[model samples]
Target: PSWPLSSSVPSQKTYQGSYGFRLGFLHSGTAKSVTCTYSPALNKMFCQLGKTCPVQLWVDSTPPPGTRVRAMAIYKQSQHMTEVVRRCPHHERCSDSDGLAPPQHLIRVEGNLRVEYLDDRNTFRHSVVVPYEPPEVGSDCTTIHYNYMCNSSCMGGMNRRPIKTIIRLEDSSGNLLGLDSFEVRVCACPGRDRRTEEENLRKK
Candidate 1:
C-alpha cells in the first residue's frame, strides 16, 4: 500500500499540441550517423542540412495530386479480324468461338489500345483523373473493355456501306495522337439463308 507523505498540493501540467519524431541518416567525414528530430506538419519537406553536424534533421510531407490525366484505349472495328460464320442448328456441330454469326446490323471492330500515361509530361505531373478499363485480379486482358457501337443502315443505303470515323488522342500537354479518318463496313443483318454468291465473292 502507498500513501502521500505530506498534505497534497495538486500537480499542474500544461497542455500542448502533439508532435512526432523521425530518425534520419547523414554522412560526415567518412562515417555515417543517425539523427532524430520533431516531424513537420503535412505536405512539407526539409532538404538542406545546416551547421555541418554529424547528423542532419529534415522532414517530408508531400501528398499526391488529386487529379491526373492519362491516355487510354483507342480502337475501332477490324474488317479482317472479324469473321461471321453461319452455324448449324442446335443438332449441328460448332467449334469456333465466333461461330455465332454476328448481328447483321452490327460490325465488330478490334483495334490497338493503351491505358497509361502516353505523354512524358503526364507521367507524374497530375493525379489519375480518369482511369481506363482496369483489369480484374489475375487478368491478362488489362487494356480497355470491348467497345461495341451500333451500326445501322439508313433507309436509302445499300446492304453494305462504309462508315467513316475520326479517332483522336489528346494528351495532358495538348499533344494529339491519332488518325485523321478510318472506315468501317456495316453489313446487313444475318439471315437463315446461306450467304449469297456476291457476298461470298466480296469476302474473298
Candidate 2:
C-alpha cells in the first residue's frame, strides 16, 4: 500500500533521468494474478495477488461469488528499447514540473492496500469492493481519464488477470467510506508481474 509515481512525459532536450517505478499490474484481460517487488532504483512497490494467483472463477462474463478485481498501475521500463512506460491519471493529484518531474499524469493509490481473494475451496478473504455508481450532478466528473499509451504494446503475460475498476467516487459509503485516503488514479490497461511455482500451486 504505497503510492508515488509521476511522469507526464515532460523533459525535452533529450531528457536525462527520472522514470523508475515498475511495480505494476493493470489488465483488461489476461493478467494472471499478481506479485511484485520491482527494483531498478525504487519508488517502492510490491504485490501478492489473490492469495498468490488462481482465483479466477470467471472474468470474461464477469461472475464470481465475489472476489476478483484488478488494476495495479504505476510502472515504467524503458532505457533503450522494449519500452514499458505506463503512467496514467491514477489516484489523481497532479502538478507538472517545479518538483523535479514526478506527477505527470499520476499514480498513487494506497488506501490501506491489502487484498486477498478467493472465497471457496481453501477460502481466503481480506475484503474486496470495486463497484461504484453515483454520479449525475451534471456528471462531467472531471473528465475521468487514464489511458496513457507511450510505448503501448505489452498486453497480459506472465500469467494474466490484473485489471478491475468501477471506482468513481465522491462518497460511496461502506468499508471505510470512500476508502480512506484513496487514490488509484485511473488504471485499465496492459499489466502483469508475478505468479509461477506451477502457477501458484495449480489453483489451490
Candidate 3:
C-alpha cells in the first residue's frame, strides 16, 4: 500500500480569509516534536510539542486572488519507533486580530468528521461517530465537506511488531480523506522482528 502523506488527503470548503484556521492537537503526552502542514503553504511546518505554531494561510471571504482553497485544517502524524497516531481537526478563526498569531483557543471541527480506526490483523474496526446525526426535519443535506487521513509506521526488532495507524477526516458534506497512513517496518537487530519481515516479504 502507498504511504499516506499530509498533502494527499482532501480538505473542506474555504472560510473567510480574515478568520483564518488554526490547528491544534492534544499535548497529553510527552513527544519530541510534532509536524504539521497548513493549507496554502507549499511546504510543511515542523513543530515541537507544547509549542504552538501559526498557520500562515490567508483566504478571501469572497474568493481570493488564487485558486479557491478547499479547507482550513491540519493533519498530524507522529511516530516513536512502532507507536504512531494522527491528530487532525478543521480550524476556524480565533477571536482576535492576531488570529494567525501563535496559540490562542478553539478550532471549529467541520460537521460529521468521524474518527474510524481499523486493524485488519485482528479484524478490528473502531469508530467514534461525529455528532452529525440525522435531523428529524427535511433530508436535503446539500453540504460540501472534505475528508483526510494520516498514518505512520516504525521499524524495530523482534520485540517490536509492524503496525499501521490511520486518521480519517470527514466533514458535513460527507467527504473522505485518509490523511497519513504508513507502515512502521521493524528491520534487523534487537529492534527487528523476523515474523514481520516474513509477512512483508510474502505480501511483496
Candidate 4:
C-alpha cells in the first residue's frame, strides 16, 4: 500500500524525513550485475539488475538528515499487512516447509544511521533495529536485498563508491529501538548501455 508523504512533520515538508519506497526486479537476459539508489524526496528505492528490471522504482519514505541506510529482505506484503516479515534462511532438514518454512530475517553488518529530528517533532523516531544477515546458499541462493546508501560518493572505486548504511540508536530504556537507514548506490549510470554498435547503425 502507498502511504502519502507526511504533511504533519516539518522535516517532511522539506521532503527530508518522510516515507520510504520498496521495489523488486526480475533478471532474465544477459545482465551481469545489479545496483540500487535511494532518494529522500520520494523515499524511493529501486534496484537495476540484469536485463529485465523496470526502468525505475520509487521510495516510500524519506530518510532523516543523518539517517544511516541499509537494505534488508522484507517479505512481499502478504494477505495480512499488519506485520512485516524479514528474510528467511533456507534449510533442507528443518521440515517446516509450508511455504513459510524459513524465516525472512535481515543479516546486519557494520553500519549506522541517525536522525537529528531538527523539526522539533518526528513520529517514526523509533523504528525497530534488527541486525541480521542473509543465508549462505548455493551460487543462485541469494537474498534479493540491497542495503541503500544515503550519502554521496562521486569519487571512484568500491570502498568509496558511495554507500547507504543502517544505524541503530538506543533509547532511555537501554535497549536498541530506533534505526536510521537511507537508500543510495554506486554510480548513477543504469548499467552499461547495452545498445550495441550494430543496433546504433540500425537506428540511424
- lDDT of all the models against the reference? 0.22, 0.23, 0.26, 0.27
Residues 115-191 of candidate 3: C-alpha lDDT, one tens digit per residue: 22222123122222232222135632222222222111221211233233232333444344223222222122211
Worst 10 residues of 1 by lDDT: 43-52
- For model 2, the run of ten residues with the poorest summed lDDT: 177-186
- Arrange candidates, best TM-score first: 4, 1, 3, 2
TM-score of 2: 0.20
Measured by lDDT, the strongest candidate is: 4
Candidate with better TM-score, 1 vs 2? 1
Q: How close is candidate 3 to the true structure, as a TM-score?
A: 0.21
TM-score of each: 0.23, 0.20, 0.21, 0.25
Candidate 3 segments exceeding 4 Å error: 1-42, 63-84, 87-171, 174-204
State the lDDT of candidate 2 residue by residue for 1-204, as single tens digits: 222223232111211112111112222232533232222122222233211221111111212233222222312233311211233343123343223223322122232223222221221111233332222366322111122221122232111212222221112332121111111211122123222222344343
lDDT of 1 by residue, 78-125 (tens): 441122111113211222222222222122222322223221232211
- Candidate 1 similarity to native, TM-score: 0.23
User: Scored by Cα lDDT, where does model 2 land?
Assistant: 0.23
Off by over 4 Å in 1: 1-136, 142-152, 156-161, 178-182, 186-204
- Candidate RMSDs in Å, in order, are 32.2, 18.8, 17.2, 16.0
Question: Is 2 or 3 the stronger prediction by lDDT?
Answer: 3
